[PDB]
Amino acid sequence: GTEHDAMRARLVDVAQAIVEERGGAGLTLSELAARAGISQANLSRYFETREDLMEAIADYWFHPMVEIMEDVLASDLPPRRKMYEFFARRFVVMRRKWEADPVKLQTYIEVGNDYFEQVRSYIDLADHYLGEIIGEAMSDGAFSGLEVDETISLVNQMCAPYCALNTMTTFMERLSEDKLARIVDAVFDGLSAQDRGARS
Amino acid sequence: GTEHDAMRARLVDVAQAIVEERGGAGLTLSELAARAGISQANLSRYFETREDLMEAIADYWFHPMVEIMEDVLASDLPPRRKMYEFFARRFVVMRRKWEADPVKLQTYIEVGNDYFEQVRSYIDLADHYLGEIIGEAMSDGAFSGLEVDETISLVNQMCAPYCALNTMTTFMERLSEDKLARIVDAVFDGLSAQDRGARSLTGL
Numbered sequence: 001g002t003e004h005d006a007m008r009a010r011l012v013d014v015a016q017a018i019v020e021e022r023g024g025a026g027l028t029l030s031e032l033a034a035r036a037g038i039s040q041a042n043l044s045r046y047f048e049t050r051e052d053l054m055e056a057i058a059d060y061w062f063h064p065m066v067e068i069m070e071d072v073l074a075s076d077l078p079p080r081r082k083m084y085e086f087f088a089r090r091f092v093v094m095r096r097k098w099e100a101d102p103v104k105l106q107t108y109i110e111v112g113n114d115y116f117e118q119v120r121s122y123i124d125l126a127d128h129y130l131g132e133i134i135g136e137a138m139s140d141g142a143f144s145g146l147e148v149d150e151t152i153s154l155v156n157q158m159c160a161p162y163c164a165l166n167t168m169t170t171f172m173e174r175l176s177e178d179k180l181a182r183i184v185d186a187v188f189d190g191l192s193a194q195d196r197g198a199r200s
Numbered sequence: 201g202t203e204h205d206a207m208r209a210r211l212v213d214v215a216q217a218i219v220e221e222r223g224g225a226g227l228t229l230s231e232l233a234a235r236a237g238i239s240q241a242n243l244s245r246y247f248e249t250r251e252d253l254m255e256a257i258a259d260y261w262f263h264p265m266v267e268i269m270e271d272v273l274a275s276d277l278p279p280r281r282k283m284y285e286f287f288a289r290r291f292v293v294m295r296r297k298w299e300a301d302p303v304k305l306q307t308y309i310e311v312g313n314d315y316f317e318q319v320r321s322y323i324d325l326a327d328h329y330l331g332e333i334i335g336e337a338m339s340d341g342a343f344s345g346l347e348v349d350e351t352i353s354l355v356n357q358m359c360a361p362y363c364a365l366n367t368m369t370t371f372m373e374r375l376s377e378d379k380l381a382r383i384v385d386a387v388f389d390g391l392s393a394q395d396r397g398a399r400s401l402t403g404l
């Protein structure tokens with residue numbers, strides 16, 4: 001029932017942790033069982049085959065980040081607050097991983113990129129949710145003259161170190177919640193279709 | 201004199217091309233003279249040893265980018281225009297490499313990454329010049345309440361795909377001068393020390 005599905009989700013979480021510890025390859029049903037405190041026979045009740053475990057870890061890889069985005073969009077926060085939290089909450093989790101072990105963040109990025117369907121789905125879903133925020137912001141009068149698609153691109157290009165994991169890795173020591181707050185304020189109060197002299 | 205310095209720069213350019221193709225591992229000093237058209241003895245007048253040549257190659261690696269930054273800073277453009285040109289003119293040269301062949305840009309990145317001191321120096325000089333643009337903008341009234349150091353960091357963080365080469369590579373297909381112009385306008389009209397609601401309801 002729900003206790004079974006709660007346990008399966010808990011096992012997938014332990015499996016993701018082992019993958020990160022090992023630097024990618026080396027996950028076995030043997031070690032998962034040993035780490036989870038269950039037997040190999042009991043583990044097969046949750047993962048019938050090794051392949052099912054491998055599928056589960058791939059499907060769950062970016063799920064924690066998806067949940068964070070879903071929670072932010074489901075909140076009652078105004079668009080500016082939503083945009084900040086949309087990036088900030090994910091940044092905080094990734095920074096924590098890097099603070100504990102920079103190699104675990106490296107592994108997280110490397111493994112994630114090998115999961116074709118999942119990483120592409122995640123990136124696409126992220127843009128979809130960013131669009132929902134931008135659309136509401138526009139009804140409030142922000143981003144005057146811009147289309148949602150071009151604004152999604154502009155925001156992704158202005159917030160890259162707080163979102164794109166390879167950029168985040170490069171900039172990590174210089175990143176902060178204080179700086180991201182400044183950026184989001186600058187996006188909201190500075191981004192529009194009105195040419196203001198950058199080129200003329 | 202002036203002739204000696206032109207030939208030395210020609211030799212550094214040829215040597216740089218050889219290093220990009222094969223590394224220093226393939227930089228035959230007899231071939232540098234042979235591929236530049238001069239004598240090996242005549243090549244000794246420009247570089248005493250191989251170490252002198254390798255240092256010249258490393259020291260000039262980022263010079264095209266330095267020249268661009270110096271040209272922008274030396275101009276009479278207002279700070280907003282300077283900030284745009286400071287990023288755009290370098291971006292345009294990098295995109296041009298990638299357009300010729302994405303491998304050309306990757307090679308430029310990897311070879312440059314080995315010159316760790318020269319990379320560091322370049323970034324430091326870049327921050328110096330961006331700092332000068334920011335200082336002038338501040339005198340005009342921009343970036344109210346912010347310090348120069350934190351503003352340099354904030355601008356670098358907002359323009360990262362147009363400057364950080366690995367990020368530029370990833371974003372390349374989606375980058376444009378039009379988009380960079382929008383970002384610079386947003387930096388100038390949007391960035392300041394006044395909290396405006398990103399982090400709490402009090403700011404809104």
Ligand SMILES: [Cl-]
Pocket residue numbers: 152153154156157371374
């Ligand atoms: Cl983009």
Ligand SMILES: [Cl-]
Pocket residue numbers: 171174352353354356357
């Ligand atoms: Cl920075």
